Amino acid sequence: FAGTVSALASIGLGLLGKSSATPSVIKGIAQQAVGAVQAN
Amino acid sequence: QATILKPQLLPGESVAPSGGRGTMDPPVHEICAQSIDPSEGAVGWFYKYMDPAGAVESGKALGEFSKVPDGLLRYSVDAEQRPIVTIECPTVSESDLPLDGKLWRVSFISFPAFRLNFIALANINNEALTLETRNTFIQTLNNITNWRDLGTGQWAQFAPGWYYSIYVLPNTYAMAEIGDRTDSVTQFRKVYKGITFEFNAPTLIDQGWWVGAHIPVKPQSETIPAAERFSAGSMTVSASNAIFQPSNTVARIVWSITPLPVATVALTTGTGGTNNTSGKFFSVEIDGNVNSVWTFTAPASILAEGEPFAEEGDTTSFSMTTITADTVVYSVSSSLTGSSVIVRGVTKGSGVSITPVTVGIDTEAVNRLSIEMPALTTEEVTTNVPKYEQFLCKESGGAYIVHYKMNNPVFEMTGEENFGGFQFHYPGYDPENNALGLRGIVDTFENNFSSAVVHFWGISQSATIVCKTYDGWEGTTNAGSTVGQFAHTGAEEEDEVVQLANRLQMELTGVYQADDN
Amino acid sequence: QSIDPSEGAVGWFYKYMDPAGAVESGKALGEFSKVPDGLLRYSVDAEQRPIVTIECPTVSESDLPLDGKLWRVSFISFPAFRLNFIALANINNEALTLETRNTFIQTLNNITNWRDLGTGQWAQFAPGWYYSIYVLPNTYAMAEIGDRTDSVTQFRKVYKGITFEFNAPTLIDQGWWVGAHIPVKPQSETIPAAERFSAGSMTVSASNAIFQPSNTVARIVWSITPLPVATVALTTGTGGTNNTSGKFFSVEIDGNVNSVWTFTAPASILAEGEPFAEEGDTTSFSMTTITADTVVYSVSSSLTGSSVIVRGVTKGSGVSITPVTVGIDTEAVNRLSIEMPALTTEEVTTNVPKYEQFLCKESGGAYIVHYKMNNPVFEMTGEENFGGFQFHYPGYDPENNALGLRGIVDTFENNFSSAVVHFWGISQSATIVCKTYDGWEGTTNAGSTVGQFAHTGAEEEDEVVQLANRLQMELTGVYQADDN
Amino acid sequence: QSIDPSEGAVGWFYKYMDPAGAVESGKALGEFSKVPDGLLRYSVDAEQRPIVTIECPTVSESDLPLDGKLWRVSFISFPAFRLNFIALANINNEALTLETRNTFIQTLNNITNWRDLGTGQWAQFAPGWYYSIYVLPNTYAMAEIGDRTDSVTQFRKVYKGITFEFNAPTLIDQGWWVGAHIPVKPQSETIPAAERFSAGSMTVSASNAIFQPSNTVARIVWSITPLPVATVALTTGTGGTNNTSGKFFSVEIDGNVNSVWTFTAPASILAEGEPFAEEGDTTSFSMTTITADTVVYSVSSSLTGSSVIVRGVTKGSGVSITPVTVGIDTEAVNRLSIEMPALTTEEVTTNVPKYEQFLCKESGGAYIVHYKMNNPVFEMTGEENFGGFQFHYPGYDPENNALGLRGIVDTFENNFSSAVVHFWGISQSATIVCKTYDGWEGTTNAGSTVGQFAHTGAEEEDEVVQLANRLQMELTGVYQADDN
Amino acid sequence: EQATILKPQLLPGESVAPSGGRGTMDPPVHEICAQSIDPSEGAVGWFYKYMDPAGAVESGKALGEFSKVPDGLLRYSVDAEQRPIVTIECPTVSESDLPLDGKLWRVSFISFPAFRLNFIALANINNEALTLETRNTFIQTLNNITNWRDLGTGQWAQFAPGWYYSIYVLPNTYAMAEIGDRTDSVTQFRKVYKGITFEFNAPTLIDQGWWVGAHIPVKPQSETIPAAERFSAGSMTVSASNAIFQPSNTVARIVWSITPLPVATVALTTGTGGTNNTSGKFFSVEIDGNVNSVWTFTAPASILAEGEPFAEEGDTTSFSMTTITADTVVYSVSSSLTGSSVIVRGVTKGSGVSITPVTVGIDTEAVNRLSIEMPALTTEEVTTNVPKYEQFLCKESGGAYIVHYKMNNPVFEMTGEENFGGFQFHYPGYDPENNALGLRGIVDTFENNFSSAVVHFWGISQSATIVCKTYDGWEGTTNAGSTVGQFAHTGAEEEDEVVQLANRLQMELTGVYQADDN
Ligand SMILES: [Ca+2]
Ligand SMILES: [Ca+2]
């Protein structure tokens, strides 16, 4: 349970699980997973 | 709408004061919608992939449009080459009248190839192509030796009323294939490729029409053996005619030799008129009269008709005994005493004369790519293709062609797999007429994209074609890559769009008018 | 949105799913032969349903002897463009031993002018073994640059459905079978193109000529790869010369030892570091000894100083290769190293878990539905992997491979799984009818006839395609014939 | 309930992601070696977890000296079937001269029986440089032609990912590295099949022997391209031999200029266009000279009038090759031209952006994780691209490439990043433990053992995979070991 | 606040045909609206990069096409970063064992805002004080390098006894061949920023070491190598040394090379080997060996030395060593020329190189060399003469991190071809006599704008090394054959509004920092 990279999955996999399943949406989570953000 | 920014450190990553990565995924300016948020690159790409030339001057181009939005590559370099070539009739057909109502035919083959743009061949006379006519053509493109020394876009006679030239893509072509300085990238994809064939004609005699149609072609790596002590080769003497001088007097044969090393051919005994390559293998461009004789020191041992002909330190002398206004007889002569002379019958503007040679030179193995020359027939295309379009050049101020991910439903990464010596086969065409060694075009062929051709017909000697091409390639750089310094993260997968595109494309004809550019 | 798919995309569905039943269930709608992946801007989709009557190698077609004797017959189906499938049979229900196996293989790779077996007709290849090939008419029809020539820039099987109906009198309506799909991609092992001379090999298979004194006569089919087709005619003795339509040199003959066949060399030849003939010599091939088991042969020519040639070939199994060099030239043309789908009823089980097996009595035969197994999408299979495939397999020694352009030359579907079906307890008094609904979709480059049929590639019907290979997946590509 | 992937997906996802944390985090569950793309009827998924402790070349795995000396070690993981990666090294702290790297490569392009190297044992190709080949056991274990002879049709790497733990005592952690995934694809440059005489070549790589007279005694690796393997042994002189296991001829031996080993020809051989020796004739090999940088080798044939060989070879440099020609028959096999993933710290950092460098001390090693980097979807490498790994690179000229079936013989996983991890300035006294969690999915054609656990393909779970794919294109694939 | 501007593809009023017009579109400008300005990321990004070329990226400030100086000067431009990372290591004397409580080295770096070239290394194993002789021996060397690309591999190179240096180039730019057959480069160019972090790769404890860094400007004033025809005069150098693991007393290595003379494949004719060849276009070769060993090749062009005809287009000249000691060596070059003379010459291994003046029967391309006054080498010469420097113990700083900046000019005047050359180095106390004639030395264009730097390290345990993670940004204007024209497009807009800061900011501080602040 040291995997960071792994956490960075279950985090998004986590979302996905209750996410609209849109591949567009997937992009969303997939960036959130990397912990990205909307700057300003 | 809004901008996105990913962190160097992944949630939790604990880097040192100089660790991490050295990059910073350029921000995401993906635009927004009720259902999707493609990034300007994703978007730009869509339009570019769709209407390359237009979408740009259309203003709809933007962001990493030269990158494909299918979030496949973790990192990738990419760009677009917009080389603009002006194709125009080869023969300065001298006319006495004030109105040389002459017309010429011309056709272009587009290959979604890494370094190659498209091919083109015209007929000074508007005559169509004959089988054997066509064949010579073909066998010529297979026999082209130091092909690189042709990218200049220069015209080249192969048939009587026929010439042909090949156009590279300025930079990718500007990336050599030698072990010393330049080697390609690990692989790539033709992100989108379009060409406009502007009908540059005097708005006086704007006659003519053209047919365009996309045809997919996948290459076949019919590879060449790696030789050691000796290597098999082919001595080529494609006899031709002096674009100006008297056939029945002077000939213009091109003389190359498949695996034998490039060695300067200086005309010694004769009248004069030579132009040798710079390619790695030995080839020559020379025109002259009978008595004339060129020379050169044979880089390596050479056999032929069984018996040895030359040795490293030998000096070969090539001449021509007879020059009918259409046929040509020639002689090849070795220093090496005990050897006998070589002679052979050719026919300028016709097939080449082959000479199963053998060169005392280690031979790197390299594949040759067996590629079916797309319907070149005035009217074959018209048949095997329903999605072809066609109008008069007058109307459609030219032709607009947009290639597309034709072969694979999705965008694979055509890599080194299919790379090599283009060697075109076709129906009715005999390969026996195919030159040996690694000659012909050499390039990585985007096996995903749609190859495609467009023949112009019934135009005027005066009318010329400005081919504005927009080639968009993306690939992964390895080493020595003079480009690796441009690669960033690969486009994000926005299939939402992508699919649409694919549909359109499919749904559409990759051909349009240079007025819909 | 209803998820409305073109009625023709639906056709494709069932067709892919159940290429045979779909037709029968009328569910065969629209131009079902085009793949709804919305890929091609245009394309030609075709579907040949060629039917073959498989009889037991020796058993007549006329009279059906109710022997109450049996025979093992298996078929290997390949998603090859024109090649429908291959079938091999043992007139004694026997097992496929190694040599037999290897011989079988060996043969297929050394099949010179393979077009010579376009005819479903059998061909002994071992002591009690025969094999034959089944081409897909319409495609096989596509003469590779002859007089009548059309062409396709690339294609992809849209589905393949073969159903080996167990045509056996209910009387001895016995035996069983095992079917299974095994995906195989080919590798392009190249046959270097050459000039003044071209290396090659002179093969000479030998085996008893059904209906001739076993120990006396022997039917043999000897060929010579780069050597251009030569017209052989018996020169002196007991008749028995069947020639080839082929482009290279091959001929099947039979006769007394003293019998002699001869033809003129259409190009200079070399054998055992030595010369053998000029482009005009009169080559003479005959036999020295004929054993119901073995056979010695020897060929010579009018070439002055031309030594003779001699080697032996134990009748029924393998060929006597002869390293040769021909005076003509070769093309780049390469063979296709292709793994050979488990030929033993053994491995098939021990390797394919989604394989099936029923008795031919209940399961009126065996019906298999080929499917895109190779890659998750319907990639286009073009030129890239076309060539004379030569199957390799454990045990099989490449040594036995010819040297020229041999074997079944065709294109392989870089996607569809190949499948094999072994019938075991069949009664010679039974024949396996083979319904073959196989439909490909490709693109034309040059031709005078096919073009006019090319329209638009089926629209991207993502939703269907989706489930499509989803089902095929969780499903055994094998099925009870009667379930077609 | 948006979607419910079965464990085998999750477990997979997490693995094709953090193949270490997956397991470590117990997140790896279900039959995870199968890609939930749902493309197979049946498939055998598998995960080989080799843990090799890549110790410095000249080091005692026993009483390691707390030296404080350095050494470069670059790992170039390839998504090959039974090939984990290659290990580059350099005891003397020296850069990779073109000479050097060109020597390196050629070594790997001319490795006679690469199998003889599976031991991953160190091999000195250059004065201070070594290499070695670590393999994915279990697969490699399945003997190529085998005894139970299990044969896999097609496969596909489902997830590479391996960590290169920086095994070093706080005393000496002086170390820093940097990885990066660079995709690679093999272009099948085919080796032709010939008949009576097939060409090949004779290689001889000379170098000094560990703990031996750097000018009095030198070790070479003499081999022959298409030559059938034959046993050698010192005949007269200072002992020192190591025979090959492969089907071709090669051997490693140490000794002085007086030392002479010999073996008997397995078949005819021509050399310098001259019959060097026939079947019987016993060939001898010795050294006219021996220094610290050069060696004159010379092979004497038992043949009568058989002129012998004499050759200069700078030990530590390339391999001096003598074109050959054996009387054996050869099957045409495929050599695979393959770009060599940037071998230089800079070459890598400037051309690849998604690289990630670290100080070993802080980053407890390195952890790279490959991923389907070519096909946007998991196609299925099979026979498709299998052969002799023969690499090139900028600079490298094939002028020094072996004519025979050499190099690393395997199948390169078409679509999948091959990566590189360079460890610079590592303590002599430190090693790299390499636990790779490699997994693949394939199909069985013939075998007796593998086709048992062959089951159904993974259930097509897009979203899952979809995401997985997003994260990849998204990531670096190179992380602090502390992140596995 | 955010904003996105779009420059139409047309101009107000332009009536444009479909087919034609402009072929390139303008990448959309994204501006960060500020209460006083709204630069585009390609600015900020730059800004930051230019300012902290590493920490700006590690931090998350490297936005857009930051490799483009925002000063609306170029219409079109090519931008690109290069982050080569070499791990300069101690050189090799021999597997000569190594105790931790023992040996260590001194290694210095000189970084020049040169287009292709990255930085020049230099180290002394036994840890030495740069003696005058040592210096010259060095400089003379760098200069007399024939096919400078020959070592672009960033491989160590000896010269003085126990002294080695090396050259590291911008892997991608070095990758772009010069004056090659059909090869050439960009039109102009200008470093957009460039910093280097010499991470201190040292064992946690043997953290011993101290380094100094400082920015010192240097501009190349060019001197020319005149063209000629019948024969182009030049000279052949031959330096000496003892290969590694080599009996220094009787096995010497030499960097024998002739200048205007064409590379001619050198081949060992007799005796032990020890011979390396050069890819470059000029005759250069590296051989070593027992005294009486012989080398050779076929003299490509008419050679005349010692005022005497020495060779012809075909003669085969060979080089053998008369007497080789563990310090000095006497060599001999013999012509296969009918009654030619012979060249007996001797050189001191660890120092200097024998220049035998020659004249080659070959035409020459006039190409000038750049008189670039080499910067500091004297650890204390810096400290004293350059105020804005910073010294640190590696123990208390993971290393050094320097960052340059247009110092030579307050503006960013594109430093085109105007100063291209195989720059030989100039230094206080160096005889330009040791200089090689012909066009040798490292070839390249020098950013006639940026400050060059130097960063000497001492007391670095042999076992400790230095990872030199660099970040060289630059933008030029491509012309023809450029393998980059594609990556070209619209120039950066003028953000002097910001630029200014950056300038007066840099100057505000040193260019030297801690390798833990990047
Ligand atoms: Ca593919
Ligand atoms: Ca100025």
* String of DSSP letters for C198-259: EEEEEEEEEE--SSS-TTT-EEEEEEEEEEE----EEEESS--EE---SSEEEEEEEE-SS-
Tell me the C-alpha to C-alpha distance, in Å, between residue B118 and each of B108, B112, B158, B164, B406.
Answer: 6, 8, 17, 11, 17
Closest of B319, B315, B312, B309 to residue B340, by C-alpha:
B309
Contact D344 E462 (CB under 8 A): no
Tell me the C-alpha to C-alpha distance, in Å, between residue D65 and each of D55, D62, E202, E376, E501.
Answer: 12, 9, 18, 39, 54
CA–CA distance, D157 with C28 (Å, rounded to integer): 38
Chain-centroid distance of CA E362 in Å reads: 28
Checking DSSP bridges between strand C431-446 and strand C151-167, what pairing results, if any?
antiparallel
Say if CB D38 and CB A17 are below 8 A apart. no
Q: Which residues of D touch A28 (CB under 8 A)?
A: none
**Hey, what are B352's tokens?**
């080449």
Q: Which fold has domain E72-226+365-492+510-514?
A: Jelly Rolls (2.60.120)
Q: What is the resolution of this structure in A?
A: 3.8
Measured between its terminal Cα atoms, the distance across chain C in Å is: 33
Report the residue of chain A nearest D10, measured CA to CA.
A13
Beta strands in C371-430 (DSSP E): 381-382, 386-392, 408-411, 418-423
Per CATH, domain B226-363 is 2.60.120.920: no
**Hey, what are C99's tokens?**
């040599």
Contact D384 C186 (CB under 8 A): yes
Exposed/middle/buried for residue E223 (C-beta within 10 Å: 0-12, 13-18, 19+): middle
Q: Which residue has the tokens 């004194």?
A: C213
Say if CB E47 and CB E39 are below 8 A apart. yes
3-state secondary structure B99-144: CCCCEEEEEEEECCECCEEEEEEEECCCCCCCHHHHHHHHHHHHHC
Residue B405 DSSP one-character state? B
Sequence spans of domains, chain B? 1-70+492-508+514-517, 71-225+364-491+509-513, 226-363
Tell me the C-alpha to C-alpha distance, in Å, between residue B127 and each of B104, B179, B457, C319.
Answer: 7, 44, 9, 53
Runs of H (alpha helix) within B279-385: 381-384
**Hey, what are D115's tokens?**
């199998």
Q: Which residues of C touch B70 (CB under 8 A)?
A: none
Q: Compute φ and ψ for B151, nearest 5 degrees.
A: -55, -20
Q: Compute φ and ψ for C117, nearest 5 degrees.
A: -115, 15
Chain-centroid distance of CA E473 in Å reads: 16
Residue B406 CB-half CA count within 13 A: 34
Contact C332 B429 (CB under 8 A): no
Contact B7 A36 (CB under 8 A): yes
Q: Which residues contact E138 (CB under 8 A, 6 or more apart)?
A: E122, E130, E159, E160, E163, E165, E377
Q: Of A4, A7, A17, which has the smallest distance from its Cβ to D2's Cβ?
A: A17
Architecture per CATH, E227-364: Sandwich (2.60)
To probe the interface with A, which of D471, D473, D475, D478 has the most A CB atoms within 10 Å? D471
> What was the elucidation method?
X-ray
Q: Of D68, D92, D349, which has the smallest distance from its Cβ to E244's Cβ?
A: D92
Contact D25 A17 (CB under 8 A): no
Helix/strand/coil percent split, chain E, to 5: 10, 40, 50
Q: Which residues of A touch D29 (CB under 8 A)?
A: none
Gap from D217 CA to chain B (nearest CA, Å): 30
* CATH for the D1-37+459-475+481-484 domain, from 3.40.1160.10, 6.10.350.10, 3.10.310.10, 3.40.430.10: 6.10.350.10
Q: Of B2, B57, B81, which has the smallest distance from its Cβ to E22's Cβ?
A: B57
Exposed/middle/buried for residue D239 (C-beta within 10 Å: 0-12, 13-18, 19+): exposed
Q: Write the CATH number of the domain with boundaries B1-70+492-508+514-517.
A: 1.20.1690.20
CA–CA distance, B242 with E303 (Å, rounded to integer): 42
CA–CA distance, D18 with D10 (Å, rounded to integer): 12
Residue D379 assigned as binding residue: yes
Contact D374 B187 (CB under 8 A): yes
Q: Compute φ and ψ for C380, nearest 5 degrees.
A: -90, 135
Query: Ligand 2 mean position to E413 CA, how many Å?
Result: 7
Q: Which residues of D touch B418 (CB under 8 A)?
A: 187
Say if CB B384 and CB C445 are below 8 A apart. yes
Contact B367 D199 (CB under 8 A): no
Coil, strand, or helix at residue D108?
A: helix
C240 backbone φψ class: left, alpha, beta (φ>0; ψ -120 to 50): left
To probe the interface with B, which of D276, D319, D324, D339 has the most B CB atoms within 10 Å? D339
**Hey, what are E350's tokens?**
């660890």
Check chain C for breaks (C–N over 2.5 Å) and list the residue before each, or none: none
CA–CA distance, D286 with D204 (Å, rounded to integer): 12
Nearest ligand, measured from the Cα of E412:
2
Q: Which domains does chain A have, with CATH numbers?
A: 1-40 (6.10.140.650)
Given this structure, which CATH class describes domain B71-225+364-491+509-513?
mainly beta
CA–CA distance, D187 with B421 (Å, rounded to integer): 13
Q: Write the CATH number of the domain with boundaries C194-330.
A: 2.60.40.4260
Q: Which fold has domain E1-71+493-509+515-518?
A: V-type ATP synthase subunit C fold (1.20.1690)
Nearest ligand, measured from the Cα of C382:
1
Contact B6 A24 (CB under 8 A): no
Contact B493 A39 (CB under 8 A): no
3-state secondary structure B225-289: CCECCCEEECEEEECCCCCCCCCCCCECCEEEEEEEECCCCEECCCCCCECCCCCCEEEEEECEC
Say if CB D194 and CB D216 are below 8 A apart. no
Per CATH, domain C38-193+331-458+476-480 is 3.20.20.370: no
Gap from B408 CA to chain A (nearest CA, Å): 21
Chain-centroid distance of CA B381 in Å reads: 20
Tell me the C-alpha to C-alpha distance, in Å, between residue C215 and each of C166, C208, C312, C319.
Answer: 36, 8, 15, 19
Residue B296 CB-half CA count within 13 A: 24
What are the b/e assignments for B298-323, b being 16+ CB within 10 Å? bbbbbbbeeebbbeeebebbbbbeeb
Q: Of D95, D291, D347, which has the smallest distance from its Cβ to E272's Cβ?
A: D291
Q: Which residues of E touch D70 (CB under 8 A)?
A: 89-90, 463, 465
Gap from A5 CA to chain B (nearest CA, Å): 8
Say if CB C393 and CB C60 are below 8 A apart. no
